[PDB]
Paper text:
For this study, we used a mammalian [name] (high-conductance Ca2+-activated K+ channel) channel derived from [name], engineered at the DNA level to contain an extracellular ALFA tag at its N terminus and an intracellular green fluorescent protein (GFP) tag at its C terminus. To this end, we have developed two separate procedures, total membrane and plasma membrane, which, for exemplar purposes, we apply to the structure determination of a potassium channel in cell membranes, with an immediate return in the depth of our understanding of this potassium channel. The procedures presented in this paper allow structure determination at atomic resolution without ever removing the proteins from their membrane environment.
To isolate [name]-containing vesicles from the total cell membrane fraction, cells were first disrupted by sonication into small unilamellar vesicles (SUVs), likely exhibiting both inside-out and outside-out orientations. We then removed nucleic acids using anion exchange chromatography and enriched [name]-containing vesicles using a resin conjugated to a GFP nanobody. Note that this enrichment captures only vesicles containing [name] with an inside-out orientation. We determined the cryoelectron microscopy (cryo-EM) structure of the [name] channel in vesicles from the total cell membrane preparation at a resolution of 3.8 Å. The structure exhibited two-fold symmetry, contrasting the four-fold symmetric structures that we previously determined with detergent-solubilized [name] in both Ca2+-free and Ca2+-bound conformations. The two-fold symmetric organization is most evident within the cytoplasmic gating ring and is most easily appreciated when viewing the [name] channel along its central axis from the intracellular side. At its most intracellular extent, the intersubunit distance for two pairs of diagonally associated protomers differs by more than 10 Å. However, at the level of the inner membrane leaflet, the channel becomes more four-fold symmetric, and near the center of the membrane and selectivity filter, the channel follows four-fold symmetry. Because of the breakdown of four-fold symmetry on the intracellular side of the channel, if the two-fold symmetric channel is superposed onto its four-fold symmetric counterpart by aligning their selectivity filters, one pair of diagonally associated cytoplasmic domains is rotated and resides closer to the membrane than the other. As a point separate from the main aim of the present paper, the symmetry result indicates that while [name] adopts predominantly four-fold symmetric structures in the absence or in the presence of high levels of Ca2+ (closed and open, respectively), intermediate levels of Ca2+ favor breakdown of this symmetry.
Residue numbers in the entry:
A (entry chain D): 224 to 342
B (entry chain A): 19 to 33, 93 to 461
C (entry chain C): 462 to 570, 577 to 580
D (entry chain C), E (entry chain B): 819 to 833, 871 to 937
Amino acid sequence: LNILKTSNSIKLVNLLSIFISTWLTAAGFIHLVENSGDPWENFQNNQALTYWECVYLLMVTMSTVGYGDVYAKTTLGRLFMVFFILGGLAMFASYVPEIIELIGNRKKYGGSYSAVSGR
Amino acid sequence: QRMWWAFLASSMVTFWMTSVKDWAGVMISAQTLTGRVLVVLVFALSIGALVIYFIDSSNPIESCQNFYKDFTLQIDMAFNVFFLLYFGLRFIAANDKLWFWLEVNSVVDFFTVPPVFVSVYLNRSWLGLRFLRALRLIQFSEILQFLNILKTSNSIKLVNLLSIFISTWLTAAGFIHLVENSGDPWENFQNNQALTYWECVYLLMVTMSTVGYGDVYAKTTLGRLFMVFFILGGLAMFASYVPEIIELIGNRKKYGGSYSAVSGRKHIVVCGHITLESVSNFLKDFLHKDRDDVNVEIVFLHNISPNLELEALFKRHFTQVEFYQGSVLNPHDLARVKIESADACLILANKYCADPDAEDASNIMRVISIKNYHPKIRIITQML
Amino acid sequence: QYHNKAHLLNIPSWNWKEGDDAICLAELKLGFIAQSCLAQGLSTMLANLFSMRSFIKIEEDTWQKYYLEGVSNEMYTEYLSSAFVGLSFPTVCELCFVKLKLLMIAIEYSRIL
Amino acid sequence: ECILASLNIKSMQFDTTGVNIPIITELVNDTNVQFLDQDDDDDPDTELYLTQPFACGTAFAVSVLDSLMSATYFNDNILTLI
Amino acid sequence: ECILASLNIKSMQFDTTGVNIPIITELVNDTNVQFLDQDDDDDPDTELYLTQPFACGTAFAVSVLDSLMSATYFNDNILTLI
């Protein structure tokens, strides 16, 4: 749909779009399943967690930091968070990001020249 | 109470000749189907013995022998008898006696079944210590090969490494759960923490994945004194083991497999030197819109794996092109690509080679191989 | 190569009489081809007398069964009985064939005849 | 070049066709045998010594000479006889 | 080539063998000294100045002469004696 062509556009299309899509879909699923409550335990330990804290908790789970401010208080949620840990640090650590380190940096002096008159 | 000496004395302190022996128990020779199903039986039996897992741990604590249970303990009693007869056959086939008492399988068996013997001779069975039995499970690659599910050399090492990773992780979690439910003996377990088998597994996961949430911790002193060494060692093993799994994730044979024929629509075969500019020049003149009849399937063929942007070219040209891997001089490969109903078979020849005659002899070689396989298809080849 | 067998022979502790034998690939290959120029098929016939193959039966009455019965044969060296001294080489040849289906091709005389 | 020359010799005609000249060809890749003859059951899995060209004697290779090491180890005079 | 020449002159046969023929040689790799003689306990651990070839004087090397600078910094021997 007529976006400026530099191939940085296609790079961001093939990296940041999929990364963002996966991040927010994981956040939404974890929000729904955590607020759903325990299925076979009569829904007792349904925590009052919303999207903002879910996103922050997912980012803390990702990378390496170990903040214990918020965590999964249910067995199913904890095990599935282990599954996201495996899936993330496999796929989005050894399939996608090598392209992002292969991009490196942009052009160094790729400007132009404007002929200032009189010289 | 806390009669751990009975298990310690039975295991730690204790540290018609061939009518049935070579007839049935063939491990090294692996001759008879009796021995084959015997190894199958011990594998499935170890799996079933370990199936108790957290639903066993979540149920009430260890007590005296009951009468009615969810699962009958007598099946596990027969399992122990089965393992004991295995230990007897290994003892009569021990060869070197000292190496027999040294070997890991014998020592782990002598660790695991004498607790069940204690349960046999006294109705005071202990639920713990009977979950770290993944050493038998570490090798199902032999089962997979015997069942011919997987036979390639690029998957056997991968499944071995995955198996031993999973087994070591599970047994570490089991020993940690034992430590948690144990407590300090010199403190008479007055500092013990109460946790089911579930949480220890995810604690091991968050230690391995260097996250460490910290919602629950290693309160026990000797537990913490073991996690220090575990963090020292398991991370080193993990970092040593990635370098011979990264390529097996990567070197996996892509664009393989056979072809599925679709009736009523023809297809041509293109083999030879294929590179981005050449396939572009072929595609942009074969699939041009003004030529109405384009309803043929342009299957490709080459030996080396495709790379660069050819994969993306085929991706955007989804319904019109395919690809396969394998040389054209192999009749099995030619049968796989299914040229037996091919309308024609084009060939692309290199025109930038330093020696023109070698490539042209190669093209002649392709033609004679193809015509030898199927003697009536139509070939349109290049020359230099 | 055949221009290095001399270099190998020049080694002080090399005794080809004892049994230290060096196989020259070019010599044997080109000898096989050249002798096949005299009689066609001798190359493959000689090449099939060393591959230690067992007998395989084919019931299709094609040439496979005959050629496989051919390749099933091999060759060995063995001392012979003492009853054959004053007799002649053709005599022991025909006697051995007609009695136990064994045929000789050479004897040690030092020298091989 | 060897397969091309063999094909040319076997195909070129005379004043009598060209299938009666005898040719012995040296080969280095055993899988290339199937191109030397046209009426045979081609199979890359089949070993050399069961193939029609090798049986006819119109082919040869250096790969079949590995057996001579074991043969001459077991029998001392075999190499001298050969 | 040098090692082969030495072995050949030792292995020459006369009507009386070549193993008693006086000969010295020249070598550039001091680890190659062991092949020169066979009635010896050829061991790679021993230094060059101790092996049987040098001990008998039937070998030499340029690398031995690298101690000349150290032995001449303290004296005047190279000026006259050598």
